[PDB]
Amino acid sequence: SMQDPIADMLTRIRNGQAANKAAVTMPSSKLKVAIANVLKEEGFIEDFKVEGDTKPELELTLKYFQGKAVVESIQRVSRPGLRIYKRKDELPKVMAGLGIAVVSTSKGVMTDRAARQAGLGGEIICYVA
Amino acid sequence: MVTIRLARHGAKKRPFYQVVVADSRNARNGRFIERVGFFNPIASEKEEGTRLDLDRIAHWVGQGATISDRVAALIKEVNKAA
Amino acid sequence: ELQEKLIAVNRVSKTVKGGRIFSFTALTVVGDGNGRVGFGYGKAREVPAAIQKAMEKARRNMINVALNNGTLQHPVKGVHTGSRVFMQPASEGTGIIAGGAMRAVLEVAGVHNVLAKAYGSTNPINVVRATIDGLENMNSPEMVAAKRGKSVEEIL
Amino acid sequence: ATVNQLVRKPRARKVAKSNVPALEACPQKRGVCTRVYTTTPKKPNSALRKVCRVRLTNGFEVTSYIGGEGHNLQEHSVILIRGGRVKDLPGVRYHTVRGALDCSGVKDRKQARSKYGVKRPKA
Amino acid sequence: KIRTLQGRVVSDKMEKSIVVAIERFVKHPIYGKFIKRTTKLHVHDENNECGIGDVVEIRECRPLSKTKSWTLVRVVEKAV
Amino acid sequence: ARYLGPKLKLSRREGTDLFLKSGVRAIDTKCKIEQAPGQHGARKPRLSDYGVQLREKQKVRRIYGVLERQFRNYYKEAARLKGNTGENLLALLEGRLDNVVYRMGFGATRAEARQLVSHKAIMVNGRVVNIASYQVSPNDVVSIREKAKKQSRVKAALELAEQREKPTWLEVDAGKMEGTFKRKPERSDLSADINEHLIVELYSK
RNA sequence: UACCCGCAGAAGAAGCACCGGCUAACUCCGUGCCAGCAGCCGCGGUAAUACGGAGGGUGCAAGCGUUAAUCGGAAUUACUGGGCGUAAAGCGCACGCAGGCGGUUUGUUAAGUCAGAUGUGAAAUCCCCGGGCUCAACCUGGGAACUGCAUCUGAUACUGG
RNA sequence: UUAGCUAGUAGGUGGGGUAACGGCUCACCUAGGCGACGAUCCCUAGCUGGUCUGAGAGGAUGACCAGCCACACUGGAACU
């Protein structure tokens, strides 16, 4: 059965980039739209949009620069089989700080650098670079 | 009874005594309740060869700790110099 | 101008009706002590001719690696058929911590302080292919900044 | 593979056995040799290897190779085995040190003298 | 204000005593997985109001018996 | 704890002059410097990468007369300190007492300077110091003893010292026979033919 | 006693392992699958850089080799960090209790998680900056670290009720 | 290639006992209590701060120093 919608979202993004798709569509969720918002303000996806009322569908407009895809490595970190939680002083720097790590803190979900600035840790949802 | 004494903690022929608050039954270099200072018997000039935490030492004497003969002389020296 | 290094020379064979024919293969790497490096694999019946073919093949099909002042720019890992390779930047004066073919290709490629490690098979041809593969897909701060459309200060 | 499986049954290590069990984690062991004989080596080589069957002081009965050229070893001699197999003999796993309690050193040896127990020749 | 624990009641057959299972959630020391670990405790239950499957709240007190050092303070979710 | 064999043999094996002699005479007039020692010296065998790293390490060790145990301790200390490992190791090596005595020209060779230090003829900050491996710090003034100040070899070495380049991190007064170590020598002051990065990767396998 | 001063004289003071490849360092003579070497691949069967001796060289040095034992290399029990078509590896197939995991929205709780504070984590040892034995080993001042546990207050995005 | 273990055994009332709580002990009543998150049985082992190694996570280890426990020819028992 489908037991990890966030991983499914990351997988749709990765496959669409590999297959040179302009946009991808998936069933929405408040956490998916939140990660999508983080990616848009960090310049990984062009724009996100959610339509529908009873079964809302989120559509992500992918981004391409110089022919090739922008996101070249995206992976789920805390997966249902093994959860990962890290304190603020030991947060990881993905690709020496050039990449980002989507971390879910108490004050919403934000990037690792923002979490370090704000001084609080949380659950590490995924790395994206 | 609780005492304040010297712990021989140093190399051969160059002693260095740690002024510790220890239960008198225990060994010299062994168990102690709180460390309250040091005493270097062979120290040269320009460096403090003795430092005592007189506040804690006074607190322990108020708590009932006795004082050794050498510890008494060292407190006398510290209070005379300072 | 370019520095050329010979990595490994071995004798390959080939059996024919007459008997065994022994040939030589030469794996060399060339580079400009900066971002340009390239490897060549030549084969002939004699070792001078083999090394010469290797140098000509190495001087062509080179790539530009966006390296830092004297080191890499982030931990990167590469793979080519049997050698999972991982390498990361190091502080000044620690040297090239690498083994076999990796040491030669890094040294010629201009990096000076790097911690490296080779997993899987440590076959020289495969590790020198995997090393330049990782180096080729190593992102730079300006490239990722221009790619995502943000300033280099915004990404740090 | 799966973390759940590893929680239910942890990763078993691989206990390595010693290739010199008769020493019992001691650097050398004294023994008295019950037999002194020769034997032939394995497939590539051919010789008459000088070996002795020794009874160790801990009860074990093992064979040991007598290094060097020539030896005065006969039955009821107290020697010292030290470990280290010879690749090319089946079942010989130990070497007898030359120069300990009865086994004299190899005569006319001028190089690698320490390994066979010979005093320095005075000039 | 005072240290207190909660847990399911797994047994109540003996008079004036019940067995309480505290269920903590600890990370595994090596593999990092969060697993449920239970700890059965013998708890003094005056008046015997507790039954099978009711979550209770216990506090540690002086030793009532060989295996009883905890006692309950109230009972919530008394349903069958 | 000191090498007592032929000095020029080491220089021949390393290929270059390791300054193991005073420098009054031409090196070529005493040895076949371009040729490795021994019977099979004419041949130039192809040296392995481990070989070139080991040769550089031995080259430096023979230059400064240090042994392996002391050198490895120096490397551990250098690796422990902050900054560039190679510069720290070269600085630590350059901070030795006898080495500083040679740089100041009191001793013609480093071996002569070492014998000078060991034979109670040097004083660091007025106190007699006898240990050859003594690390000197910035702003330290070193001088010969009053009794040993009349030795012919000392002035004979001071005149020879003028032929070589003058260290920019020292201040020597040849009349009173005293110097002043004001700072640890930067790599740019050191000879650039030593590839210290080979040693720092040879020892960190 | 440490330490210092004076006296005579280069005297009273260098050995061990290795040199076919791994592995830095090569030739000659005796022996002919014998004697023998060896940690692995492997030498020696009458032209051995692989045995034994000599000369030369290489590495260490008041030590040098060999053995025993642990870790590393070994990503060769892989949590970080491996695989299962043919190299070792998908149970012959299915149902299913305990167990692991779970679509999407709102409210409540705060157990898991995160932040802060307090108590504690003995001294020594490890690490940082200094000080004392001529230096070093050694001793020592102060700090950091002891990644943990308990309590109080708060955050509620994710997991759990 | 140890799946069942336990009758003072688990709990209650009361008496005795300990410096002190307590099946620590005794009389009666209840038939319980431990166990797949490994009880019971077998082999090995003093435990810790730490030590060696490793980049780290780990692996191995507990000699010197220091903390705790246990033992004094072997097996018990009390007295001050």
Domain span at D46: 1-123
Residue of F nearest to C99 (CA): F205
CA distances from C74 to C87, C101, D37, E4, F100 (A): 9, 21, 66, 49, 42
Domain boundaries, chain A: 1-71, 72-129
The whole-angstrom separation of Cα E17 and Cα E11 is: 9
CB contacts of D7 in chain E (<8 Å) are 28, 31, 33, 35
The C-alpha of D15 sits at a distance from chain A's nearest C-alpha, in angstroms, of: 29
CB contacts of C156 in chain A (<8 Å) are 97, 113
CATH of A1-71, picked from 3.40.50.12160, 3.30.1370.30, 3.90.950.10, 3.40.50.300, is 3.30.1370.30
CB contacts of E30 in chain D (<8 Å) are 10
Mutate to test the interface with E, among A77, A78, A79, A83 (most CBs of E within 10 A): A83
CATH class (in words) of the domain with range A72-129:
alpha beta
Joined tokens for residue A2: 């489908």
CB contacts of A82 in chain D (<8 Å) are 3
CB contacts of C100 in chain F (<8 Å) are none
Phi, psi of A108 (to 5 degrees): 85, -175
A84 touches chain E (CB under 8 A): yes
Of C141, C147, C155, the CB nearest to A70: C147
Give chains near A: 3+ CB pairs under 8 A.
C, D, E
What would the 3-class secondary structure string for chain E be? CCCCEEEEEEECCCCCEEEEEEEEEEECCCCCCEEEEEEEEEEECHHHCCCCCCCEEEEECCCCCCCEEEEEEEECCCCC
The whole-angstrom separation of Cα F78 and Cα F72 is: 10
Q: Quickly list H helices, chain A.
A: 5-18, 30-41, 112-117
If DSSP codes are grouped into helix, strand and coil, which group holds residue C53?
Answer: helix
* Counted domains in chain B: 1
CB of A29 within 7 Å of some strand G atom:
yes
Listed resolution, Å: 2.8
> Measured on CA atoms in the order C44, C48, C54, C57, is the torsion positive or negative?
negative
The whole-angstrom separation of Cα A65 and Cα C50 is: 41
Q: Which helix (H) or strand (E) holds C76?
A: strand C76-79
Q: Which helix (H) or strand (E) holds A86?
A: strand A85-86
Mutate to test the interface with A, among C144, C150, C153, C156 (most CBs of A within 10 A): C144
D90: CATH: 2.40.50.140
If DSSP codes are grouped into helix, strand and coil, which group holds residue A26?
Answer: strand
* Counted domains in chain D: 1
Q: Give the count of Cβ contacts less than 8 A between chain A and D.
A: 4
**DSSP code for B14:** B
C95 touches chain F (CB under 8 A): yes
- CA-based Rg of chain E, rounded to a whole angstrom? 14
Å from D109 (CA) to G12 (C1')?
31
The whole-angstrom separation of Cα C106 and Cα C96 is: 8
- Whether A65 and C147 lie within 8 Å, measured CB to CB: yes
| F166 Cα distance to chain centroid | 15
The C-alpha of C99 sits at a distance from chain F's nearest C-alpha, in angstroms, of: 9
**Closest CA-bearing residue to C1' of G83:** D1
CB of D89 within 7 Å of some strand G atom:
yes
Helices A30-41 and A5-18 pack at an angle, to 10 degrees, of: 40
The structure was resolved experimentally with: cryo-EM
Those residues with Cβ within 8 angstroms of residue F98's Cβ, 6 or more apart along the chain or in another chain:
F107, F110, F113, F114, F116, F117, F132, F133
Those residues with Cβ within 8 angstroms of residue A90's Cβ, 6 or more apart along the chain or in another chain:
none
Q: Quickly list H helices, chain F.
A: 7-14, 49-64, 68-80, 85-94, 97-103, 110-118, 152-163, 196-202
**Which nucleotide has the shortest C1'-to-CA distance from E37?**
H37
**DSSP code for C127:** H
- Whether F197 and C93 lie within 8 Å, measured CB to CB: yes
Joined tokens for residue D123: 């000039």
Strand order in the sheet with A23-27: A23-27, A57-61, A47-51
Strands D49-56 and E68-75 turn out to be unpaired
Q: Which of residues 67-126 of A touch C (CB under 8 A)?
A: 70, 72, 95-99, 113
The C-alpha of E24 sits at a distance from chain A's nearest C-alpha, in angstroms, of: 16
The whole-angstrom separation of Cα A62 and Cα A17 is: 7
Domain span at B5: 1-81
Q: What domains can be seen in chain F, in order of their start residue?
A: 7-93+190-203 (1.10.1050.10), 94-181 (3.10.290.10)
- Whether A83 and E31 lie within 8 Å, measured CB to CB: no
- Give me the numbers of helices (H) and strands (E) for chain A, helices first please: 3, 10
D40: which strand partners?
A: none
CB of D9 within 7 Å of some strand G atom:
no
Joined tokens for residue C99: 């083994």
